Amino acid sequence: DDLIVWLRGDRAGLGPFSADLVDQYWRWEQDPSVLIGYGRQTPDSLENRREGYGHQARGTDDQLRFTVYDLTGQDPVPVGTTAVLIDHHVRTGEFVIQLGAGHRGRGLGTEATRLTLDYAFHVSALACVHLAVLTPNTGAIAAYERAGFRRIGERRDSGFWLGRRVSETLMDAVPEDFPGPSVVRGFVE
Amino acid sequence: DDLIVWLRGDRAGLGPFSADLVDQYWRWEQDPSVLIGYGRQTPDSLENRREGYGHQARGTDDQLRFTVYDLTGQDPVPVGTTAVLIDHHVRTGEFVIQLGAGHRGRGLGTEATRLTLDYAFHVSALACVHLAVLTPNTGAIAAYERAGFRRIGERRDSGFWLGRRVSETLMDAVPEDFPGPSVVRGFVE
Amino acid sequence: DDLIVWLRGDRAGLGPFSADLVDQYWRWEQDPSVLIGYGRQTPDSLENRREGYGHQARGTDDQLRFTVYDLTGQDPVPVGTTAVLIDHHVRTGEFVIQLGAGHRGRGLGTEATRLTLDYAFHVSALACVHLAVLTPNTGAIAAYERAGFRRIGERRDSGFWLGRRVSETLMDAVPEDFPGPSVVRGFVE
Amino acid sequence: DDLIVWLRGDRAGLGPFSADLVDQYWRWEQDPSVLIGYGRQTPDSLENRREGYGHQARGTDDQLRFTVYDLTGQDPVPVGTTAVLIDHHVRTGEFVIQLGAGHRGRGLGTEATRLTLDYAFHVSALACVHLAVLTPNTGAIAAYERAGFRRIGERRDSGFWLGRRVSETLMDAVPEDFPGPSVVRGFVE
Amino acid sequence: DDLIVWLRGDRAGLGPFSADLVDQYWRWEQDPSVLIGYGRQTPDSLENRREGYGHQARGTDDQLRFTVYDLTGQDPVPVGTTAVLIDHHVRTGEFVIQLGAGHRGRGLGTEATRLTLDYAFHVSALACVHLAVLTPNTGAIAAYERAGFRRIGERRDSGFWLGRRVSETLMDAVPEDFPGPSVVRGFVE
Amino acid sequence: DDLIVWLRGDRAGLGPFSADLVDQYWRWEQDPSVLIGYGRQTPDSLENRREGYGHQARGTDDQLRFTVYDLTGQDPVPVGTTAVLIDHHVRTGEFVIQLGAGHRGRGLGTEATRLTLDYAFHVSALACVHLAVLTPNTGAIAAYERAGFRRIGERRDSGFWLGRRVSETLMDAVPEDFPGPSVVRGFVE
Amino acid sequence: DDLIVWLRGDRAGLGPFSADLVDQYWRWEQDPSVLIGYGRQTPDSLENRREGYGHQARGTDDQLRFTVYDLTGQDPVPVGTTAVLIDHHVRTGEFVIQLGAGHRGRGLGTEATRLTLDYAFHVSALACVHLAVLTPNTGAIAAYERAGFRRIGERRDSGFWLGRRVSETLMDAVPEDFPGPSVVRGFVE
Amino acid sequence: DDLIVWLRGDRAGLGPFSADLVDQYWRWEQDPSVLIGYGRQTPDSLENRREGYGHQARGTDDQLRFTVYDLTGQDPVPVGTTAVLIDHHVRTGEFVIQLGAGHRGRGLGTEATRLTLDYAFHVSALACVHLAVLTPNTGAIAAYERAGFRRIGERRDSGFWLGRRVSETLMDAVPEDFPGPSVVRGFVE
Numbered sequence A, B, C, D, E, F, G, H: 001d002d003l004i005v006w007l008r009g010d011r012a013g014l015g016p017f018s019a020d021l022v023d024q025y026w027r028w029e030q031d032p033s034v035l036i037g038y039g040r041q042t043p044d045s046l047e048n049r050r051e052g053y054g055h056q057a058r059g060t061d062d063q064l065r066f067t068v069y070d071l072t073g074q075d076p077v078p079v080g081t082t083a084v085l086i087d088h089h090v091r092t093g094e095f096v097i098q099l100g101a102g103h104r105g106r107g108l109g110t111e112a113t114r115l116t117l118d119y120a121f122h123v124s125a126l127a128c129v130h131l132a133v134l135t136p137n138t139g140a141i142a143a144y145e146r147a148g149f150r151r152i153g154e155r156r157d158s159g160f161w162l163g164r165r166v167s168e169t170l171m172d173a174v175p176e177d178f179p180g181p182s183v184v185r186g187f188v189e
């Protein structure tokens, strides 16, 4: 009961950024695969993450942070994190997502991104959600495309993939391109 | 016995803004339906709510905060929150209200608003209580109309409803339009 | 040359909220006519205004503050102040204006409000600008109507006019109702 | 002699971010045309700019800030500002530029951007310099294209132009696409 | 389960710089053999190491710190430490390593250095990793040579070995000289 | 008379790190040629240099800082800076040097480096002075070789020269290889 | 196991300056015989020693502090303290030693001093270790002579022995005069 | 008249440690000859000397500091500094002295040391004054011998002279060996 779930999809759900899962968030973010995908170069310390959780918690006016839950089992189980950095001046946000090592390839990322887009479009009233992802990360490309993102173009020589200089793909999503039924509309109506 | 009830209606009651219910207030305020109704775009953190409860508690000179109780059962059970921001210079206040997910549609909001208006008119000696509510939120419109509010007009293009730009309805209430018997008069006489 | 003018109309102009005019802003705001029009009940001190100017200056992210200049003479002369409190979440702002004692009735308020609306619509990208003004203040009503505001309704018994309890008129403006040519478009094109 | 010039082109030059020009930087940045081009919605105060200059000055490890000088006259005259926010992890930077009201259309922006790219490529050893510019700002598009930037794509509905929701064009530059002779190579060889 | 292992080789593995092992890190670093190999002259205190662990933990932006685990047994057991001081301006890092007294001569240092080089090359995207080691320390020379380092030269009379003034050997490693399969590539692909 | 000269060579001399020349030190260090030679990527601010001069001045226990004077004229004139970072544990130091734009190619760097080596060897009692210099900087190579440095080797791919990844040459100097007469011996005997 | 032993001789050993033995260090240092031998005139308080232990612990860059253990029994037992104050500028140190009341005359002081000299010569790379000891303290003279110290001379009238003004003997030790096998060499080879 | 002289000899005199001569004290102490004689390895900064003068001034309970004056001219002229660090527990002090570059070889050091010894013996009631001086510094040896110091012995390999490891001579002085008439006795009798 301690795990609150706000949006419930068919396969995944979103909840608050609970403080009981700071260690799990650290362990998820420190995985080498996540570091390669994000492009971060150095591991962060658990103490620094614990200290930074408070500053993340106070600064929630222009920041969306959700815990992704797997709803296929009897009870929800946290599997990843989604975040949107909101620029209230232009109604746009920047989207990031990561899942656990054992929860990838089961589809959860697609519905997690779709639910995050639903929340950003129908609750935060954002006009555009965009992201930057390294080109070789084709799985993330497919997940974002099926979630509702569209390709903008390639920013040449602005990232590293296994030490090699590669471009990154810029993608964006708009409310009129949002696929599937919206859970938020079910909440309102 | 810890749950103090000040005003007792037929279906609902009002009590103090207890500190034992900060987590419940957070959970009520973080519901997607409440966020859509209020028009808030980003969820707030539990730690920030716990920290802000103190600043709410000290600043009570020009702020009314009540906990709504359901009195249909054997014991009172908290179901929502009401608040009035008082401007002592002109004897006016701004009214907000929200109930829990499982307590809506049973009428409790109407008597909660009526009791809050009774307290504001006959204890706080306010000359006018007003609110701003999004136009598509028709249930709140009906609740406020039956509670004693009257429609002023529509403020064009000043809010978002499921990402769509919509107007909001401005409403006000005056003591001479207060319906039904007053509990405060029973307290005094 | 020290008086910077950003927007230049036919009769009036807008400039920055200069620190060399804090005493003049105080003297303008302390006039009994301005106190009656705004509805403020107690005079403010010059020292408090000087201290508060800094806090006004730092907090400019969601606040527009202009100095109104009379351009009918050879050189610009400050005659009043305009301000818009911006709510970036919904792209709306609240508008206030006051002129000097000897500068009223010459029309400067109308073009000052029109230029402020032009700046808010075409630079700040606001979807709605609204204000609250006491009903007996008919001159301000006419100025706002000719500037581009439209009447919403009357909020009953929410203000004092010469000690008498009176209602206040709520007005709003939208970009599609903006009259006349836009100076900002001339700046861009 | 107080105006130091580091890079000297045929028409323009770059110098340090002098503290004697904080007021001029403020006046340049506060022009309505610059606000429209950047997409900033509210004017900043002179006191806030003076206070922020120090924090800009200390934080120079990952920030390039230049003053653009017009070298067509007998002595250099400052006309604008260029800045590159450097991300040392991936050797990329984000580029912004603005000129004075009376210095546009004379070509100075093109050589200013070219010299900034030369400095970033041959001194800062950046692999990619990118920018985001509103689509209707066609003059900036042409200036960046002739300076050495290439179009990536359009980010839909992520900015405002005169109150209208418009897309912004993403551009990038790479060392192998740098046009013209390099001044830095003349410095080294 | 508390011992997290990120990279797993055939004989050794790398994990985070856990706070539960500060005393063990102190005891490893205070061994006379480690002091002779590093060239440190005075022992450090346990209290100073405990205090300094926090400052090490916060400063992780340009610092890699791993705990070396022996994977030959049933469960991982910490045996040493590896560290890389990263200079993000030139994509280079300085490498140090030490093992426990009872864990030397079993080969663990070679694979520990190889895995650290793999992490630095394919996750941190470093172009060169270098170290300085005293010339008489021939075992470390052989370990670094088999791990992937190449000899640069000897810096004359810049260190002490058992009180005698000796030179130190400078070594470096580049991605194109990295031997063996890469674990990070297995993580990505 | 304010310019103190400690060591006097035939062409150049060394003096204290005077506080009257902080602006000149800034201007010398900010030259693009000096930035290319050192490998620094971003310019530093004058205010930051003025603030950092104090911290340089207090920390003089393990730091040598000299002002290079040209003694060919009637009076000494400052032309550059030399610095040695001393590691008292092993009696070694790291050497850097830069001259002004108009003072290069006249030989002053060679005698400045020779006098700095004389001071480090015969006053600081250092056993080895070493430096790291980019390979394409052949003029500095020749200056260091004639001053008394000897080549150690090349550290592959650890620096940038005009945006190109290049190696840097490591050099060292020992007292027994010090050329020419020593001024310090003339001081003592 | 809590008692760490670094250097192990035939009769005595050296370990870290443990914080669990602050009271024992106080009791050893407060003995009247130790006060007479050192020449200290007033007893120190236990609280002051406990407070000063921290400042001793942080300041370990130029300070060697060991706990002397008696290794003749089954388990090591602390019997005294040795300390060397290191002057890194000239590679020299000042040596002091004291043992417990019941541990003197068994030879432990000789091997404790010899092991401290071994550590200072072969780990700290000190060129000279010196001490000052009162002339009537003949037992300490013999211990230092057999440990490896040589007599320099007598400093006339610079100390008190039982209230009588006496001279003190100055002694020094050099690496080439170090007797017996070195444990540190066994550690290295 | 500002130059106070306490003890007046035939050729030299002693005065207070005036604050008007901090720059002159710095310049005297920074001379390469003084650095070689004392054995200091790095120059000190003028700002650090100015800051440290205050801490020298407050701490005068166990510190004698004099300014040496040349009395051969019409008016006293400062030529050097003498200092005695007093250990009040044993009535002993450590003596240092330095003169200006142009004031050596005229004998002033001998009478300066003699007057300092007179002050220490007959005013401070010290039983022994000692010093440590490098062996090759034969001029200081002769000056101390004629002043009243006697040789104790040589501390082997504890100092550097022009980079060469040399011994230092230890000397002491006692009241019964004080030569010549005492000025302090003339003051008292």
Ligand SMILES: CC(C)(COP(=O)(O)OP(=O)(O)OC[C@H]1O[C@@H](n2cnc3c(N)ncnc32)[C@H](O)[C@@H]1OP(=O)(O)O)[C@@H](O)C(=O)NCCC(=O)NCCS
Pocket (backbone or CB within 6 Å): A033, A034, A037, A038, A096, A097, A098, A099, A100, A104, A105, A106, A107, A108, A109, A110, A111, A131, A132, A133, A134, A137, A139, A140, A142, A143
């Ligand atoms: C990308 C990531 C965040 C999650 O996205 P994702 O879950 O992998 O993307 P998907 O949801 O499409 O994975 C679903 C896979 O299951 C398959 N699948 C399809 N239908 C399915 C179903 N009904 N049930 C189960 N699996 C299904 C899909 O084909 C897909 O394989 P594919 O993506 O190669 O086409 C995760 O891979 C990750 O943690 N990456 C590391 C961090 C990172 O890269 N972040 C992004 C940086 S911007």
Ligand SMILES: CC(C)(COP(=O)(O)OP(=O)(O)OC[C@H]1O[C@@H](n2cnc3c(N)ncnc32)[C@H](O)[C@@H]1OP(=O)(O)O)[C@@H](O)C(=O)NCCC(=O)NCCS
Pocket (backbone or CB within 6 Å): B033, B034, B037, B038, B096, B097, B098, B099, B100, B104, B105, B106, B107, B108, B109, B110, B111, B131, B132, B133, B134, B137, B139, B140, B142, B143
């Ligand atoms: C609006 C809100 C705060 C509570 O008001 P409310 O309880 O829904 O309004 P009501 O009391 O009229 O709901 C009573 C319903 O029960 C019905 N009802 C009538 N008589 C009843 C009775 N005797 N017993 C039970 N139910 C009855 C009413 O017809 C009404 O349906 P209707 O409102 O559609 O006409 C709640 O809906 C809510 O939490 N909204 C989200 C937050 C929010 O919107 N706040 C306002 C923003 S300004």
Ligand SMILES: CC(C)(COP(=O)(O)OP(=O)(O)OC[C@H]1O[C@@H](n2cnc3c(N)ncnc32)[C@H](O)[C@@H]1OP(=O)(O)O)[C@@H](O)C(=O)NCCC(=O)NCCS
Pocket (backbone or CB within 6 Å): C033, C034, C037, C038, C096, C097, C098, C099, C100, C104, C105, C106, C107, C108, C109, C110, C111, C131, C132, C133, C134, C137, C139, C140, C142, C143
């Ligand atoms: C309202 C106020 C801010 C300025 O607005 P304003 O300048 O008075 O409104 P106007 O510009 O229409 O005054 C112009 C008058 O000149 C007349 N006029 C018309 N054309 C004109 C022209 N070409 N040239 C000169 N005068 C002209 C107009 O008829 C108008 O009279 P009217 O307003 O009664 O119809 C000023 O009156 C004031 O300082 N009030 C006190 C503070 C206050 O009330 N603030 C508002 C609280 S919300």
Ligand SMILES: CC(C)(COP(=O)(O)OP(=O)(O)OC[C@H]1O[C@@H](n2cnc3c(N)ncnc32)[C@H](O)[C@@H]1OP(=O)(O)O)[C@@H](O)C(=O)NCCC(=O)NCCS
Pocket (backbone or CB within 6 Å): D033, D034, D037, D038, D096, D097, D098, D099, D100, D104, D105, D106, D107, D108, D109, D110, D111, D131, D132, D133, D134, D137, D139, D140, D142, D143
């Ligand atoms: C864009 C800006 C920063 C400077 O760039 P710019 O100087 O206008 O771009 P240019 O250098 O090409 O202007 C040169 C003009 O002179 C013309 N020109 C060509 N050759 C010329 C020559 N030899 N001499 C003089 N003029 C010449 C060019 O055709 C060009 O006209 P065009 O740009 O429409 O084709 C300036 O317009 C500005 O301040 N904008 C507001 C702030 C802003 O928009 N910043 C960018 C937000 S990302």
Ligand SMILES: CC(C)(COP(=O)(O)OP(=O)(O)OC[C@H]1O[C@@H](n2cnc3c(N)ncnc32)[C@H](O)[C@@H]1OP(=O)(O)O)[C@@H](O)C(=O)NCCC(=O)NCCS
Pocket (backbone or CB within 6 Å): E033, E034, E037, E038, E096, E097, E098, E099, E100, E104, E105, E106, E107, E108, E109, E110, E111, E131, E132, E133, E134, E137, E139, E140, E142, E143
């Ligand atoms: C150097 C040090 C850090 C670890 O490196 P290392 O483990 O000793 O180097 P190695 O891995 O090659 O030791 C493996 C030995 O086992 C032998 N070996 C070879 N194959 C083996 C196998 N399959 N299984 C077991 N042992 C094997 C090797 O021949 C080697 O002996 P050698 O190094 O003399 O040739 C460790 O010695 C140490 O702690 N030193 C003190 C601190 C220090 O010196 N740090 C470096 C300062 S820069």
Ligand SMILES: CC(C)(COP(=O)(O)OP(=O)(O)OC[C@H]1O[C@@H](n2cnc3c(N)ncnc32)[C@H](O)[C@@H]1OP(=O)(O)O)[C@@H](O)C(=O)NCCC(=O)NCCS
Pocket (backbone or CB within 6 Å): F033, F034, F037, F038, F096, F097, F098, F099, F100, F104, F105, F106, F107, F108, F109, F110, F111, F131, F132, F133, F134, F137, F139, F140, F142, F143
């Ligand atoms: C390198 C630097 C610091 C000064 O060193 P330098 O003065 O250039 O080296 P030199 O003293 O040899 O220059 C003397 C030149 O004059 C010539 N020369 C020879 N004899 C001469 C004489 N008697 N009189 C005048 N000139 C003479 C030499 O041939 C030499 O040319 P060369 O160096 O190409 O062979 C300066 O070039 C500089 O500021 N560089 C930028 C910063 C930098 O690179 N620092 C080093 C980074 S580690």
Ligand SMILES: CC(C)(COP(=O)(O)OP(=O)(O)OC[C@H]1O[C@@H](n2cnc3c(N)ncnc32)[C@H](O)[C@@H]1OP(=O)(O)O)[C@@H](O)C(=O)NCCC(=O)NCCS
Pocket (backbone or CB within 6 Å): G033, G034, G037, G038, G096, G097, G098, G099, G100, G104, G105, G106, G107, G108, G109, G110, G111, G131, G132, G133, G134, G137, G139, G140, G142, G143
């Ligand atoms: C001096 C002191 C620190 C320890 O040094 P020490 O142990 O007394 O000196 P020793 O090791 O030689 O004592 C060993 C004695 O055992 C005898 N001995 C010789 N061989 C022995 C053996 N194999 N086994 C046992 N005893 C032996 C020695 O003859 C010696 O007697 P001696 O010193 O009079 O010749 C201790 O006496 C002490 O605590 N003094 C008070 C503090 C102090 O004075 N500090 C020094 C101020 S600088």
Ligand SMILES: CC(C)(COP(=O)(O)OP(=O)(O)OC[C@H]1O[C@@H](n2cnc3c(N)ncnc32)[C@H](O)[C@@H]1OP(=O)(O)O)[C@@H](O)C(=O)NCCC(=O)NCCS
Pocket (backbone or CB within 6 Å): H033, H034, H037, H038, H096, H097, H098, H099, H100, H104, H105, H106, H107, H108, H109, H110, H111, H131, H132, H133, H134, H137, H139, H140, H142, H143
């Ligand atoms: C040592 C020092 C502090 C001053 O001492 P000093 O003045 O040189 O020693 P003196 O007074 O003997 O110099 C007098 C010289 O004049 C000669 N002299 C003798 N009688 C003389 C007279 N009547 N008139 C003039 N000169 C005379 C002496 O023979 C002597 O030469 P000598 O010392 O080689 O024999 C000074 O040399 C100095 O500044 N040294 C650098 C700092 C330093 O070394 N400090 C000591 C470190 S512990």
